[PDB]
Design a protein around this ligand. Structure first.
Ligand SMILES: CCCCCCCCCCCCC/C=C\[C@@H](O)[C@@H](N)CO
Ligand SMILES: CCCCCCCCCCCCC/C=C\[C@@H](O)[C@@H](N)CO
Lengths: 274, 240, 242, 242, 240, 274, 49, 49, 48
C-alpha cells in the first residue's frame, strides 16, 4: 500500500511510524525499536599508543551495492596505495597550526596523482602518518585530526560584512598545506576544542612522536572528483605549544606521510589537473 | 574508563532513557528555516510573488543543529506559516510552489509556471492552518551536505568565482516559490515563515558545533576581528 | 459523513508535533543511502567523546584564544598550590562550553550521569610530578587548601609517569537529573567544583622547560543521558545571516 | 462525535496530494477499455527509444531547421579532425532537447543510468571511413586533439562497414543521480562531452558524394531512471492559447 | 545494445526506482486546466455565471504533458480554487455545475439549469477549501483523444467548416458551469481556477512532445514564421 | 461495497488505492503492484534489415470483447487485404517530405475503397511498404514513420494570430499525399526529431532501399469511419538529404505500397465518398 | 483528539455525493412497504417499452 | 479524504474533557518515579483521617 | 619527495636503533651481471 521511500529505508534501524499516504517519507518520525607496510613503503608506529581507525571503519573498496558508476574502476593497489611523504612543516613555538586537504595533497604526486588526474572519479581511504620527532626534553602537543569536509571560512573582511571566500591556494593548498590563520576556530568558525569528535590523535611529545590516523573514504557519494572535492582536511595543530630550552634542537619538523588506502579510480579521460 | 575504577561505587539501577538524544528527537522539532516577505510596497518581493532558494542555513538555530553533522539524510516536514507583518490572519489565498532545479522559476505572479502541471504546489489560505507537507530526501547524493570541501565544477578556480567553493549542488534542492493567487496585486502585506521538521533522520560525521556568529548562508565564514571564544570567561583560572 | 468533534488542539502548529503530512512527490524514491562512515544515531555518542575543556578560559584575546585549551603547570614552592579550578557543570557558562558535551548540553535542559575529564600532561618526558585533581561534591565551596580538597572525590595524578589521567566526575546529585546550574537559584543543580592542586610539585631537570601545560579533555560516561531537548544558549546569533 | 484534532496541513490544496475526492457521478461506469496499441505504462519506455539528437544545432533558420537533425562528415586532410561536439547531458539546453529522452528529462529533476547515442551514417554505400566517437568523462575539457579524446570512453566506428554505431555513454558519475547540468554550479552534474573525430577520413570514390551526413539517434539504456518529477523548462509557452 | 558490449563494466547493484516515471506519478499532479473570471464589470462573464467548455488544452503545461500521448484514459480529480483577482478569500457561495453534453447549459445566473436535479453540482464557499471532486473517465470512446486526425461529421469538408477538423466529440465532455448562487449580482469579482489531477491513467501511442508555442486549444497549429527549434542553439558544432 | 468503475478496471495492472466512496474512480491514484505476400500481391523485403511491427502488435481482427457494433462485419480477406501501390513521390535534393493519411490513401482504390465507401465502419491494420531504390553511389536517409492521429496544424497565418485549419486536400490528401511544408515540426508543431517514438523505419540508402512498417489498427474505437477519421499518417521524410554526383540517376522515386491487414467493415449502406 | 487533516473537498456540497446525513427522526420506522404493482428498479425497463 | 461530519461540540474547550493532546516533547522520558511515602490515590483516604 | 616514490622505509632512529632497508630484487633480468659505469649500468640495482 506504500512506497518504501523514506530516508531511513536502507538503514538497519526499525521504525514504528504512523503514515496515511502511500509514501513512507510522509510518515511520522516515530520512534525506534610495529612496521606498517603498504605498497613499496614502510613506516614505524612503535610510539603512537595505537593507530586511530577513522570512525572505526577500515578503508574498504567501494561496495557494489554502494557504487553507481557502471565503468570498471581501476585499482592500482601498490603503485598508488603506498606511503607518500609530503614536505615537512617546522613546528615552532609560534606555530599556529596547519591543514592538508585530501586527496589534494596527493593529486600531484606519484601514480596516485596521475590516476587522480586521468580519472574523473576517485575513491580512497587514507592511512595518515603524522610524525614529529622531539627529544625527551622537548614538550608540546599536537592535535592531529581528520576533519571531514573541512570547508575553510574566511575572516569575512575581519568585520564580517565582506562575503569573502578562501582562494584556491587556501581551499586546496596541495602537498605543502596551509597554515591556520585562526586555529581556534579552525579557519571555519568551528572550535578546535571540539575537533576531537573527528578522527584524531595526539602527538604528545613526552608520550608519542607520531600519529597514525587511518581514514576511510567519507562522502555522500561512492566516488568523487579528486581535483574539485576534498573529502577531508587533516589538521595538525599545536594545542600545547612547543617548548624547549636553548641548546635543544629548535628545528622540530612535522612530516606528513600519507597512504591512500584502497584507491579506486573511475571515469578515465585525459589528465586534468583541476 | 569507569567509575569504580575511580571511586567506591554503589549499585544504581539506572533506567535513564536515551530516546530524546536520538537524531529524530533532536531534529524532529520544526524550526524556522526561511521567512519570506510578500510586502505591498518596497523592493523585497513587491509583485506579489517570491522565489526562495531552498537553504536552511539562513536561520542560525536550525543551521547550528544541522552543522553539528557534516552529512544529514532526512525527510522533512515543511510547514509554512503565513501571516501579515503584524501577524494578522487575512483572507488571502497563496500558492506554495516547490520549483525543483531545472523547473521554470516563476518570473512574475501571473507566470505560467504557477499552472503547476508537474511541480508540487500547495494552495492554502492564510485563514487555513499553516500549510504542512512532507518533502522527501531529494538529493542526488545519499545525504545532504552542509559542508562541501570543494568546488562543483572543474577548471581554474579563480577568485571571481570563489563563491562556488562550498556550494554543493547535491544540496540545492530548488526554489520554494510563493505567490498570491491572483491576476491583481494582493490586498495584504504577507510574511510566509517556513518551518522545517526533519524526520527519518540519518546523520554522519559529527562536527564541532559552530562557536562563531554565522554571517552568510553558503559558507562557514566568521568575523575575523570579532572571533569570540567558544564560551564565557573569567578573571583567573584559580577562581570561578 | 462520520460524526467527528474537533478538540481544542485543532489547527495549531505544534513545532514538535510528530504528525503525518501530505507528500509533495507521490512516488519519489530517494537516492539509495550508501554507507557513509561516522553515522551517529544518538547524540550521547558525541557526549562520550573527549573534547578539549577550556579550563584556561581567561585569555579572551583573539591572538591568545589557543591558550584557552591548555593550562600552565609550573614549578612551585612545594605546597598544595592551586593550579586550576572549574565547575563540573557541563551545561554551565564557563569552561565546559568548549566541549561537545557542553554544547550538546546547551540543547538539552536536564542531564544525568557521570562525567569524565581527561587531563593530558603535555610537558617533557623528563618533567615529573604529582597533581591532586579534586572533584568537590556540590555542597563544598572552593577549597582554600589542597587539604580541604582531598576530602572530596579526588585522584592523585603522577603526570611524569602517567601522561593522561581521567578524573571521572561521579554523578553525585540529590535529583536524578540536573537542570544546568546557573549563578542563581539553579546553583541547586551545580555538579560541584573541580580543582587542580600540585600534589608534589612540577619537578623538572636541567634542559627541560620549567613550565608545562595540561590539556583537559572533558566528556561524559556511558551512564550519561540528557532530556528535555531545548534551544541552546551557548551560541546566540547576533549578526543576521546575509 | 469522534474526538478529532486538525493538523497543520488542513484545508491546503497540495496539487500532488493523492487523495480521495467525491465522485460526481454516483454509479457511472466508464466505456470499457478496448485494447489500443502502444500502451505506455512508464515514461522510461520512451526514454529508451532512439530519437534524433540535434548535434547540428547551429541553423536556427526556419528553412534550415531540418539541417539540425544531421551533420556533415566530409573528406578531410586525414588528421584526427573534429567533426562534431555535444555535451552528454540529456536534460541540458542544447542538442539533447530534440530527443524524447531530453524532453522527458525536462519533466524530471534527476536522472541516472547509461545513455545510448546511435550514430547513423547516411552516406553512400561506396563511402567509407572511420570515426572516433569519444565520450569524455566530466572532468575532461573539450579535447584539443583526437589523441586527447581517445583517452576517454570511445568507439571506433567504421561507417562504410557499419552504418549505425551506438555510443553507449556509460553512467559515470560521482552522485547516484544527476540533477540536469546547466552553465553554472550545476555543471557539477555534467555527464561530460561527446566529440566526433575522423579516425581515418571520409574516403569516397569517384561518383559518390564528397559530403555525407550522420543522424545521431540518442536514447537511454534500460538502467536509466528519472526522479523528482518537475515542470519542464525545455518548452515555455509565450503566446496565450486562444 | 549493452554497456559491456561497449566498455569494461563493474557490477552495479542498481536499486533505482522507476515508480516516479509511471503514468500515475507523471500525471497525478494537479495542474491548471482552466481559469474562469467571474468579474463585477466587463464583458467576460459579467452576469455572475460562466459556462466553461471543458478543455484541458487551454493551459500549455498540462496540455504538453497530455499531448505526449495520443490517447489517454483516466479518471480525473478536479479541484476548483476560487478567489478574487487579488487572491482574496471572500464570503461568497458558488455553484459548480458539471453540465454534460446535451444537458441544458445555463443561459443566466438565475437559470433553471442550476436546480441541478440530475446534473452534478458542487455548492462551495470561497471560504471553504478548494472544491475537489473525482470525475470518471466519461468518454464514449475507450480513451480521450488529444489528436483526432479527422472530422466528426460526414459530407463536403469545405473551408467554412474546417474548424471541425481535429474536433473529437469523444473529448467534448460538456460544459463546466459556475455561478454565484444568488438572485442578485455578487459583491465580489471572482476567479475560479480549475486544477485537474488525473488518476488511474492509461495512455497509448507516445507522440513527439510539442516543440512550438501552442496557439489555439482545439488544433496543433503553430506560428509559421516563428518556428523555433526544439532546443537551444550554438555558433558551431565543433564548439559548445 | 464499490462499483468497479475506475479507468484502469479493464487493465491487467493491479492498483493498491485508497477509496472512501462506492465509485472506484473516486479512489486515489495509488501505486502499482524475403517475399511478403498478401492477397494477389507480393513485395520484396530483402533489403530492409527487419520489418517494423507497429508497437509490437500484429494487425489482428477486432476482438469480440473489444467490439461494440452488433452488425456482422465483412472481411473480404483477399480482395481488400493486398498490397496497394500508390503513385510515386520523387525524392529530390530539396524534398522536404511527404505524408499519407490512412486509410484515406485507399478509400478510392480497389475493393478496399469500395468497402470503405459502402460501410460506415472500418477497421484494418496496415502493412506499409515504403520503397526507394537508389544506387550505391546515391546517399540520403528517409525517416519512414507512422504517426498515429496525425492532426495537421497550419502556419496559423505565419504570425500565429489567424486560427487557420488545414483544408480537406491537406488533412486528407488521398493516395497522392501531401508534402510537408515544415517537416521539422511535421506541419503539427511537434518535432520530427522525436518522430521515432512512433513506429518508424529508416530508408538509409546505403543500408536499405525499402521500409516495411506493419501497423495495427490504432484507435480509441474498435471501428471508425474510413472517410472522416484517419487512424494514422505515414510520414516519409528526408532527414538526411538526397545527394549524388551529376551522372547518377536524378529521378529517385519513393513508391508507397500499402497492404490493409485484416480489414473489417461494418455498417453497410450506400457508397459514400466522404 | 485523533489527528486529522482536512482535504480540499471539505465543506463542499456535491449534489451527487452519496453521503451519510444526520437522521431527523431518531427511531422513526416508516410505513411498511405494501406490494404495489409496476415496480421499476431500473429506467431501462421503460426504455424497452 | 474520509467523509467526516463535525458535530455541535466541535472547537469547544471543555475544561473537564479528558482528551488526547499533542505532546510538546516527542521522545521525552520523565525522571523515574522514586518511591515517596504518603501516596494518596483517592481523596477519601484523607476524608477518613 | 622524489625519493619516497621509490621503495622506502621511514626510520625513527631514536625509537628503533636499527632499521633494515630490504632492497627488493627488482630487475628485468633474472640475474644481474654486476653493473659498471658503462653499458653494464643496465644491471644497476638502482640507488639508495
Ligand atoms: C509544495 C509546497 C512546497 C514544498 C517545499 C520544498 C522544500 C524541500 C527541500 C528539502 C530541505 C533540504 C535542504 C538541504 C540543503 C540546503 O539547506 C542548502 N542550500 C544548504 O547548503
Ligand atoms: C460538479 C463539479 C463539476 C465537475 C467538472 C467536470 C469535468 C470533467 C471532464 C474530464 C476531463 C477530460 C477532458 C478531455 C478532453 C478535453 O480536454 C478536449 N476539449 C480536448 O480536445
Amino acid at each position: 500500500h506504500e512506497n518504501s521511500n523514506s530516508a531511513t529505508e536502507g538503514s538497519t534501524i526499525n521504525y514504528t511510524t504512523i503514515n496515511y499516504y502511500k509514501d513512507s517519507y510522509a510518515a511520522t518520525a516515530g520512534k525506534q525499536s610495529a612496521q606498517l607496510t603498504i605498497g613499496n613503503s614502510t613506516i614505524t608506529t612503535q610510539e603512537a599508543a595505537n593507530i586511530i581507525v577513522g570512525y572505526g571503519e577500515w578503508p574498504s573498496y567501494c561496495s557494489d551495492d554502494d557504487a553507481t558508476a557502471v565503468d570498471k574502476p581501476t585499482r592500482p593497489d601498490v603503485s598508488v596505495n603506498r606511503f607518500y611523504t609530503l614536505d615537512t612543516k617546522l613546528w615552532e613555538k609560534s606555530s599556529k597550526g596547519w591543514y592538508w586537504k585530501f586527496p589534494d595533497v596527493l593529486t600531484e604526486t606519484g601514480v596516485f596523482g596521475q590516476n587522480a588526474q586521468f580519472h574523473y572519479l576517485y575513491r580512497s581511504g587514507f592511512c595518515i602518518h603524522v610524525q614529529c620527532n622531539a627529544s625527551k626534553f622537548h614538550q608540546g602537543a599536537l592535535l592531529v585530526a581528520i576533519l571531514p569536509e573541512y570547508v575553510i571560512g574566511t575572516v569575512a573582511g575581519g568585520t564580517g560584512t565582506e562575503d569573502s571566500h578562501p582562494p584556491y591556494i587556501q581551499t586546496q593548498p596541495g602537498a605543502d598545506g596551509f597554515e591556520l590563520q585562526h586555529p581556534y576556530v579552525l579557519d571555519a568558525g568551528i572550535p578546535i576544542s571540539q575537533l576531537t569528535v573527528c578522527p584524531h590523535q595526539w602527538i604528545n611529545l613526552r608520550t608519542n612522536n607520531c600519529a597514525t590516523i587511518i581514514v576511510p573514504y567519507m562522502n555522500t557519494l561512492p566516488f568523487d572528483s579528486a581535483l574539485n572535492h576534498c573529502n577531508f582536511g587533516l589538521l595538525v595543530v599545536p594545542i600545547s605549544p612547543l617548548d624547549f630550552d636553548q641548546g635543544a634542537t629548535p628545528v622540530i619538523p612535522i612530516t606528513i606521510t600519507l597512504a591512500p588506502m584502497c584507491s579506486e579510480f573511475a571515469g578515465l579521460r585525459q589528465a586534468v589537473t583541476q | 574508563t569507569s567509575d569504580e575504577s575511580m571511586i567506591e561505587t554503589r549499585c544504581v539501577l539506572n533506567s535513564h532513557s536515551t530516546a530524546e538524544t536520538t537524531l529524530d528527537s533532536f531534529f524532529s522539532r520544526a524550526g524556522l528555516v526561511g521567512e519570506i516577505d510578500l510586502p505591498l510596497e518596497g523592493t523585497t518581493n513587491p509583485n506579489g510573488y517570491a522565489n526562495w532558494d531552498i537553504d536552511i542555513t539562513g536561520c542560525a538555530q536550525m543551521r547550528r543543529k544541522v552543522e553539528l553533522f557534516t552529512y544529514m539524510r532526512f525527510d522533512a516536514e515543511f510547514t509554512f506559516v503565513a501571516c501579515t507583518p503584524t501577524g494578522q490572519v487575512v483572507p488571502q489565498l497563496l500558492q506554495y510552489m516547490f520549483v525543483p532545479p531545472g523547473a521554470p522559476i516563476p518570473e512574475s505572479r501571473e507566470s505560467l509556471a504557477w499552472q503547476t502541471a508537474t511541480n508540487p504546489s500547495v494552495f492554502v489560505k492564510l485563514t487555513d492552518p499553516p500549510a504542512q507537507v512532507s518533502v522527501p530526501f531529494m538529493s542526488p547524493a545519499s545525504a545532504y551536505q552542509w559542508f562541501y570541501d570543494g568546488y562543483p565544477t572543474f577548471g581554474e578556480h579563480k577568485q571571481e568565482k570563489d563563491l562556488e567553493y562550498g556550494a554543493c549542488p547535491n544540496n540545492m534542492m530548488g526554489t520554494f516559490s510563493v505567490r498570491t493567487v491572483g491576476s491583481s496585486k494582493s490586498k495584504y502585506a504577507l510574511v510566509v515563515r517556513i518551518y522545517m521538521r526533519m524526520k527519518h533522520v540519518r546523520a554522519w560525521i559529527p562536527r564541532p558545533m559552530r562557536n562563531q556568529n554565522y554571517l552568510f548562508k553558503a559558507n562557514p565564514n566568521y568575523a575575523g576581528d570579532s572571533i569570540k571564544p567558544t564560551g564565557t570567561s573569567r578573571n583567573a583560572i584559580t577562581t570561578l | 459523513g462520520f460524526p467527528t468533534e474537533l478538540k481544542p488542539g485543532t489547527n495549531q502548529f505544534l513545532t514538535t508535533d510528530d504528525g503525518v503530512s501530505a507528500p509533495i512527490l507521490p512516488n519519489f524514491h530517494p537516492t539509495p543511502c550508501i554507507h557513509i562512515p561516522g553515522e551517529v544515531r544518538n547524540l550521547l555518542e558525541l557526549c562520550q567523546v573527549e573534547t578539549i575543556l577550556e579550563v584556561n578560559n581567561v585569555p579572551t584575546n583573539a591572538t591568545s584564544l589557543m591558550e584557552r585549551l591548555r593550562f600552565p603547570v609550573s614549578a612551585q614552592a612545594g605546597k598544595g598550590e592551586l593550579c586550576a579550578v572549574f565547575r563540573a557543570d557541563p551545561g554551565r557558562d564557563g569552561p565546559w562550553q568548549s566541549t561537545m558535551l557542553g554544547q550538546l548540553c546547551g540543547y538539552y535542559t536536564q542531564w544525568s550521569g557521570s562525567l569524565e575529564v581527561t587531563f593530558m600532561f603535555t610537558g617533557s618526558f623528563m618533567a615529573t610530578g604529582k597533581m591532586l585533581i579534586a572533584y568537590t561534591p556540590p555542597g563544598g565551596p572552593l577549597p582554600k587548601d589542597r587539604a580541604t580538597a582531598m576530602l572530596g572525590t579526588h585522584v592523585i595524578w603522577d603526570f611524569g609517569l602517567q601522561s593522561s589521567v581521567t578524573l571521572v566526575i561521579p554523578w553525585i546529585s540529590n535529583t536524578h537529573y540536573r537542570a544546568h546550574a546557573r549563578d542563581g537559584v539553579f546553583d541547586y543543580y551545580t555538579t560541584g567544583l573541580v580543582s587542580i592542586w600540585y600534589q608534589t610539585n612540577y619537578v623538572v631537570p636541567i634542559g627541560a622547560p620549567n613550565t608545562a601545560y595540561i590539556i583537559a579533555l572533558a566528556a561524559a560516561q556511558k551512564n550519561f543521558t540528557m532530556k528535555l531537548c531545548k534551544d541552546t544558549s551557548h551560541m546566540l546569533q547576533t549578526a543576521s545571516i546575509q
